[PDB]
Amino acid sequence: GQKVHPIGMRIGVIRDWDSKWYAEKDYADFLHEDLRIRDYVAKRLSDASVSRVEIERAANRVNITIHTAKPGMVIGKGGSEVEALRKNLNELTQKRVHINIVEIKRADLDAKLVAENIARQLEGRVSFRRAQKQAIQRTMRAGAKGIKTQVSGRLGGADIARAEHYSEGTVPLHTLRADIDYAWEEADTTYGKLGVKVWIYRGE
RNA sequence: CGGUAUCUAACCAGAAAGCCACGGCUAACUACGUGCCAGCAGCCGCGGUAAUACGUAGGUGGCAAGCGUUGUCCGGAUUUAUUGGGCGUAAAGCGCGCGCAGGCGGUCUUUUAAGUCUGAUGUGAAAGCCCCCGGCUUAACCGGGGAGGGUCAUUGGAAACUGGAAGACUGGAGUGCAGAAGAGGAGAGUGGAAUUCCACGUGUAGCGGUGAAAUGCGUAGAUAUGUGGAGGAACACCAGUGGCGAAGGCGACUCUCUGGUCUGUAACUGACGCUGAGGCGCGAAAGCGUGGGGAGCAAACAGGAUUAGAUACCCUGGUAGUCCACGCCGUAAACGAUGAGUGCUAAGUGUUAGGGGGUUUCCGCCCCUUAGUGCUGCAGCUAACGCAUUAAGCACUCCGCCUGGGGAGUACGACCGCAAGGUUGAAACUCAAAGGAAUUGACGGGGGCCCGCACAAGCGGUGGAGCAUGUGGUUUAAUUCGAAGCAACGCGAAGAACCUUACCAGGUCUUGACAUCCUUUGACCACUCUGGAGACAGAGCUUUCCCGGGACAAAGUGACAGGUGGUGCAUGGUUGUCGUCAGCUCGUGUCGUGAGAUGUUGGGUUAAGUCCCGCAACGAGCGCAACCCUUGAUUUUAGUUGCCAGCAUUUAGUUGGGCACUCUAAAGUGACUGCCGGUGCAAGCCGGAGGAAGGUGGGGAUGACGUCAAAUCAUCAUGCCCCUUAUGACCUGGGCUACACACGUGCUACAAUGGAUGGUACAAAGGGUCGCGAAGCCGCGAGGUGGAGCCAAUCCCAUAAAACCAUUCUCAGUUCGGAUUGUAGGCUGCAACUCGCCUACAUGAAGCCGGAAUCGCUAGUAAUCGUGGAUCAGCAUGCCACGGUGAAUACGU
RNA sequence: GGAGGAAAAAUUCU
Ligand SMILES: [Mg+2]
Ligand SMILES: [Mg+2]
Ligand SMILES: [Mg+2]
Ligand SMILES: [Mg+2]
Ligand SMILES: [Mg+2]
Ligand SMILES: [Mg+2]
Ligand SMILES: [Mg+2]
Ligand SMILES: [Mg+2]
Ligand SMILES: [Mg+2]
Ligand SMILES: [Mg+2]
Ligand SMILES: [Mg+2]
Ligand SMILES: [Mg+2]
Ligand SMILES: [Mg+2]
Ligand SMILES: [Mg+2]
Ligand SMILES: [Mg+2]
Ligand SMILES: [Mg+2]
Ligand SMILES: [Mg+2]
Ligand SMILES: [Mg+2]
Ligand SMILES: [Mg+2]
Ligand SMILES: [Mg+2]
Ligand SMILES: [Mg+2]
Ligand SMILES: [Mg+2]
Ligand SMILES: [Mg+2]
Ligand SMILES: [Mg+2]
Ligand SMILES: [Mg+2]
Ligand SMILES: [Mg+2]
Ligand SMILES: [Mg+2]
Ligand SMILES: [Mg+2]
Ligand SMILES: [Mg+2]
Ligand SMILES: [Mg+2]
Ligand SMILES: [Mg+2]
Ligand SMILES: [Mg+2]
Ligand SMILES: [Mg+2]
Ligand SMILES: [Mg+2]
Ligand SMILES: [Mg+2]
Ligand SMILES: [Mg+2]
Ligand SMILES: [Mg+2]
Ligand SMILES: [Mg+2]
Ligand SMILES: [Mg+2]
Ligand SMILES: [Mg+2]
Ligand SMILES: [Mg+2]
Ligand SMILES: [Mg+2]
Ligand SMILES: [Mg+2]
Ligand SMILES: [Mg+2]
Ligand SMILES: [Mg+2]
Ligand SMILES: [Mg+2]
Ligand SMILES: [Mg+2]
Ligand SMILES: [Mg+2]
Ligand SMILES: [Mg+2]
Ligand SMILES: [Mg+2]
Ligand SMILES: [Mg+2]
Ligand SMILES: [Mg+2]
Ligand SMILES: [Mg+2]
Ligand SMILES: [Mg+2]
Ligand SMILES: [Mg+2]
Ligand SMILES: [Mg+2]
Ligand SMILES: [Mg+2]
Ligand SMILES: [Mg+2]
Ligand SMILES: [Mg+2]
Ligand SMILES: [Mg+2]
Ligand SMILES: [Mg+2]
Ligand SMILES: [Mg+2]
Ligand SMILES: [Mg+2]
Ligand SMILES: [Mg+2]
Ligand SMILES: [Mg+2]
Ligand SMILES: [Mg+2]
Ligand SMILES: [Mg+2]
Ligand SMILES: [Mg+2]
Ligand SMILES: [Mg+2]
Ligand SMILES: [Mg+2]
Ligand SMILES: [Mg+2]
Ligand SMILES: [Mg+2]
Ligand SMILES: [Mg+2]
Ligand SMILES: [Mg+2]
Ligand SMILES: [Mg+2]
Ligand SMILES: [Mg+2]
Ligand SMILES: [Mg+2]
Ligand SMILES: [Mg+2]
Ligand SMILES: [Mg+2]
Ligand SMILES: [Mg+2]
Ligand SMILES: [Mg+2]
Ligand SMILES: [Mg+2]
Ligand SMILES: [Mg+2]
Ligand SMILES: [Mg+2]
Ligand SMILES: [Mg+2]
Ligand SMILES: [Mg+2]
Ligand SMILES: [Mg+2]
Ligand SMILES: [Mg+2]
Ligand SMILES: [Mg+2]
Ligand SMILES: [Mg+2]
Ligand SMILES: [Mg+2]
Ligand SMILES: [Mg+2]
Ligand SMILES: [Mg+2]
Ligand SMILES: [Mg+2]
Ligand SMILES: [Mg+2]
Ligand SMILES: [Mg+2]
Ligand SMILES: [Mg+2]
Ligand SMILES: [Mg+2]
Ligand SMILES: [Mg+2]
Ligand SMILES: [Mg+2]
Ligand SMILES: [Mg+2]
Ligand SMILES: [Mg+2]
Ligand SMILES: [Mg+2]
Ligand SMILES: [Mg+2]
Ligand SMILES: [Mg+2]
Ligand SMILES: [Mg+2]
Ligand SMILES: [Mg+2]
Ligand SMILES: [Mg+2]
Ligand SMILES: [Mg+2]
Ligand SMILES: [Mg+2]
Ligand SMILES: [Mg+2]
Ligand SMILES: [Mg+2]
Ligand SMILES: [Mg+2]
Ligand SMILES: [Mg+2]
Ligand SMILES: [Mg+2]
Ligand SMILES: [Mg+2]
Ligand SMILES: [Mg+2]
Ligand SMILES: [Mg+2]
Ligand SMILES: [Mg+2]
Ligand SMILES: [Mg+2]
Ligand SMILES: [Mg+2]
Ligand SMILES: [Mg+2]
Ligand SMILES: [Mg+2]
Ligand SMILES: [Mg+2]
Ligand SMILES: [Mg+2]
Ligand SMILES: [Mg+2]
Ligand SMILES: [Mg+2]
Ligand SMILES: [Mg+2]
Ligand SMILES: [Mg+2]
């Protein structure tokens, strides 16, 4: 049986959209400009541990917020990387772009970051069990109420693919006021392609 | 021996270290090379791209002038068990009995010293092991003394025990006396029920058989029924984990001849007993020889069926045999898978054959005891299942047997048999397992309970006809690819004339239609005309980067690009299905040698692992339920584009005016078996009140652990494998729409609850700026023209249709039905032939309610009538939503 | 729960 995307089940219920702008007659072009912005930002700040990007619009003016774990790489020594990004985004959109940076405290409590971590260990040939268990350990000692991870694919370069999952605490997926974060990332292996799924049930 | 041992002086760190191993057993790891190859190996086994096991290098461990390998012996091995094992199910109790030799043997007394125990004498050479002393500079080595070692000969002692002799006694054993029961065995005779065959009356067309049939018997007269006769085998009810026997085994009745057992007495003898190799005898069934008998059944055999085949199971027949007498054979899951004898060790409860006592007039009931036969259970034993006074417990005597699986109960030899074969019984070789009990799952062509529009009760359909659409098949240059029981088939496709397009024909291109960098130029593109089906070529006007940067831009060249090419069985991601089915586990305790178990089993109740009551468990978590959306009632806040009541106005809720009422949308309230009666220990169940609403009120979203190598390399991404002047790229035309046929899903009808004509009411939810498109005018109509109001609670789409009211038709293949075809037109589009949709006039096919069969649905549901939307220039009977009218039935598993 | 007797149904394959 299939499950519904836990984030999709909570958009508008207890969660919020990542694109907080309203438009009519200029909706498709705004949407695809936002998609291009997101892709270009994701391809530039790859190794900066970026957790979330949100975009807003108001009268020929694009505001971008980048929730990231370590702002020192994003916000440079005095504004080198930020201004390079802003100029490139200006040339990409032909608008006026203002870039705002915030820092994620307790970065082990965010699902995308831990999924990136597990994918990075798996790409570096670290046993899947070790990576999953250690990520669970750190996430739980960071103050979570529940963690669940699974890794699926040609595990260890075998001929037949399978999936293995581990958990600690509780993750109630059917409760609507439960605030589960969720992330899926791919690891690029010489044997194929591996998938890492992470559910984090926080206090809310 | 011999200038030998030994000793004295000078020089010298200089002339002197190797082997095996490093994953576990077992002490000691890193890198490189290789890639199921090279190879290692005592075993577990390592080698397929990250090798502490292969080779090497570094390091480490053990030993040392030695270190490894092989061969033989002992240990570990309790794996021949005297010390020191066993035989219910793992290998291991002869099928049973009678018994020679042998082994063992109740109690007491006297006597003997054969066994037993002990003292003395002689001897058990030297060397060797051992103890104490010594000698070589130590040690090895050597010497001295001592000790050890015998079922040893002579001889002296003791007499508890085993043995011998002489006596004595009954508990063992047997006889006597009195009763009891029994399918114990052999011989002869007899009885009834039933089957088969034969003869004769009545009677006519089938009988028999199977999952279905057929072979077969029958009109030459069956099957059926009544009467009589012949012959053979087996003994219904009684009948019972009842009885007898050593075992095999023994069921009708009567008689004759015979074996064994139990209880009662204490009369009699006085250990006369147990076991028992070799011998002798009995021994289910099948089989053999001779002679009878032969009704049923039935190996072999034949025919009919089933099956792909059917040397079988099933059906119709049928010979040996089953029966009797005599003689062989000597086997079995011959089993309680448990050898015989003796004694000891909690209880409860049936039954068979006896004995004693108490109650009681008898009957009967109660207690005690002997010998059998069942069940439940304590200690104890067992790996566990389990056994447990009928031991698999505790002990002793005697016999038989076992030592990893296969080869094999086989070969050679021997004995027995008429034969079939029986008894005794190996080895080479090969494997590292074979096996017993129990546990958690997964299956079964095993079972029980419970639920679901699964069946039942109903309503409407499908299968019949015409058309629309998908699939198979066939055809074709191509008819592009994918989906294949349920879970493929109005499916991907929420729009195939061109494009989409991946397919085919013909015409063209090669760093390229699409990306980064390179080298020169920097704005190239757009436009006109000529040729061409078009892609493309040929001339002119031509290209205006900005501030060396950058993205664009033309030329030439690579590095490269480009694949809807294959593998969904190498994958990520997404989905179907069981199924919104009710499950999946954990913590702490207890029970088990252990893996494990309990909670989670049992009885009720629920939609539900929902809850209650029990119970060695007490709780919790993910799944159920709740939180989210919508609908039904209502309060406050807010009145425009919504509403109009009381007021003036108008073709008009129009204009003025007002939020009263509907309405709109934010926040609350409200339903919880909350209260009442009954029932129940409780959960719960049946009714009642109030309330808009009553039993999770109606409906959504929500899909746990797992199943199907399920679907998708063609949405995307991706390992590996393929093409690269082509499997890439551009164009015009065609095809995906073919048509003897079969299937799936739908639409329209077969008419009077109806057709035609006229009149006339009542919705909801949605869409609209390169868009919706009003009024008016023109047209028979599809439509044209016109341009108002709208970025919308305002304007437009927008006529709702069934329903209702009048007139007509009057049961007719028709004034039903609309396919099919002829002509003339309308729109969109460059273009409507293949191949769009719509209109007018003409034409007027099948079709009379649909066979075997099959589908949906439990209430605002089914049935029926319209409306809107996505895709979309145009195109839906499909899909997704909206309202109008609005049922029947559910006894039950 | 244990022991004894005992009916009726029955196609082939995966
Ligand atoms: Mg599902
Ligand atoms: Mg999802
Ligand atoms: Mg998910
Ligand atoms: Mg997967
Ligand atoms: Mg000399
Ligand atoms: Mg000398
Ligand atoms: Mg000198
Ligand atoms: Mg010198
Ligand atoms: Mg020297
Ligand atoms: Mg020196
Ligand atoms: Mg030296
Ligand atoms: Mg040396
Ligand atoms: Mg090595
Ligand atoms: Mg070395
Ligand atoms: Mg060394
Ligand atoms: Mg030994
Ligand atoms: Mg043994
Ligand atoms: Mg024994
Ligand atoms: Mg055995
Ligand atoms: Mg026996
Ligand atoms: Mg035997
Ligand atoms: Mg015997
Ligand atoms: Mg004897
Ligand atoms: Mg004696
Ligand atoms: Mg000596
Ligand atoms: Mg000597
Ligand atoms: Mg000395
Ligand atoms: Mg010596
Ligand atoms: Mg000596
Ligand atoms: Mg001596
Ligand atoms: Mg000694
Ligand atoms: Mg004496
Ligand atoms: Mg006696
Ligand atoms: Mg007759
Ligand atoms: Mg006497
Ligand atoms: Mg014998
Ligand atoms: Mg016989
Ligand atoms: Mg005979
Ligand atoms: Mg037969
Ligand atoms: Mg035998
Ligand atoms: Mg036996
Ligand atoms: Mg015994
Ligand atoms: Mg008894
Ligand atoms: Mg018992
Ligand atoms: Mg035993
Ligand atoms: Mg086994
Ligand atoms: Mg089992
Ligand atoms: Mg189960
Ligand atoms: Mg079953
Ligand atoms: Mg069902
Ligand atoms: Mg039903
Ligand atoms: Mg149904
Ligand atoms: Mg029915
Ligand atoms: Mg019907
Ligand atoms: Mg129907
Ligand atoms: Mg219908
Ligand atoms: Mg049909
Ligand atoms: Mg048909
Ligand atoms: Mg038809
Ligand atoms: Mg039809
Ligand atoms: Mg039609
Ligand atoms: Mg159609
Ligand atoms: Mg076809
Ligand atoms: Mg052809
Ligand atoms: Mg072809
Ligand atoms: Mg096809
Ligand atoms: Mg495919
Ligand atoms: Mg379904
Ligand atoms: Mg289907
Ligand atoms: Mg359908
Ligand atoms: Mg089609
Ligand atoms: Mg074309
Ligand atoms: Mg490629
Ligand atoms: Mg492959
Ligand atoms: Mg495939
Ligand atoms: Mg896959
Ligand atoms: Mg699959
Ligand atoms: Mg496949
Ligand atoms: Mg898959
Ligand atoms: Mg396959
Ligand atoms: Mg299931
Ligand atoms: Mg299950
Ligand atoms: Mg369970
Ligand atoms: Mg149980
Ligand atoms: Mg629960
Ligand atoms: Mg729920
Ligand atoms: Mg309302
Ligand atoms: Mg009520
Ligand atoms: Mg609800
Ligand atoms: Mg497959
Ligand atoms: Mg399937
Ligand atoms: Mg399939
Ligand atoms: Mg396939
Ligand atoms: Mg590919
Ligand atoms: Mg792809
Ligand atoms: Mg596909
Ligand atoms: Mg494909
Ligand atoms: Mg596609
Ligand atoms: Mg339909
Ligand atoms: Mg219809
Ligand atoms: Mg008509
Ligand atoms: Mg009318
Ligand atoms: Mg109306
Ligand atoms: Mg409306
Ligand atoms: Mg529209
Ligand atoms: Mg309309
Ligand atoms: Mg309308
Ligand atoms: Mg007609
Ligand atoms: Mg026509
Ligand atoms: Mg046409
Ligand atoms: Mg056309
Ligand atoms: Mg006409
Ligand atoms: Mg005609
Ligand atoms: Mg006709
Ligand atoms: Mg008629
Ligand atoms: Mg049905
Ligand atoms: Mg229902
Ligand atoms: Mg309808
Ligand atoms: Mg109609
Ligand atoms: Mg309609
Ligand atoms: Mg309709
Ligand atoms: Mg409509
Ligand atoms: Mg429509
Ligand atoms: Mg349209
Ligand atoms: Mg339709
Ligand atoms: Mg149409
Ligand atoms: Mg319809
Ligand atoms: Mg029902
Ligand atoms: Mg029974």
From TrEMBL:
InterPro entries: KH_dom (IPR004087), KH_dom-like_a/b (IPR015946), KH_dom_type_2 (IPR004044), KH_sf_prok-type (IPR009019), Ribosomal_S3_C_sf (IPR036419), Ribosomal_uS3 (IPR057258), Ribosomal_uS3_bac-typ (IPR005704), Ribosomal_uS3_C (IPR001351)
Superkingdom of source: Bacteria
Domain KH type-2: 37-105
Function: Binds the lower part of the 30S subunit head. Binds mRNA in the 70S ribosome, positioning it for translation.
GO biological process, one term: translation
Keywords per UniProt: Ribonucleoprotein, Ribosomal protein, RNA-binding, rRNA-binding
Protein name: Small ribosomal subunit protein uS3
Entry GO MF terms: mRNA binding; rRNA binding; structural constituent of ribosome
GO cellular component: cytosolic small ribosomal subunit
Subunit description: Part of the 30S ribosomal subunit. Forms a tight complex with proteins S10 and S14.
Gene: rpsC
Organism placement in taxonomy: Bacteria, Bacillati, Bacillota, Bacilli, Bacillales
Matches recorded under SUPFAM superfamilies: Prokaryotic type KH domain (KH-domain type II) (SSF54814), Ribosomal protein S3 C-terminal domain (SSF54821)
Family of this protein: Belongs to the universal ribosomal protein uS3 family.
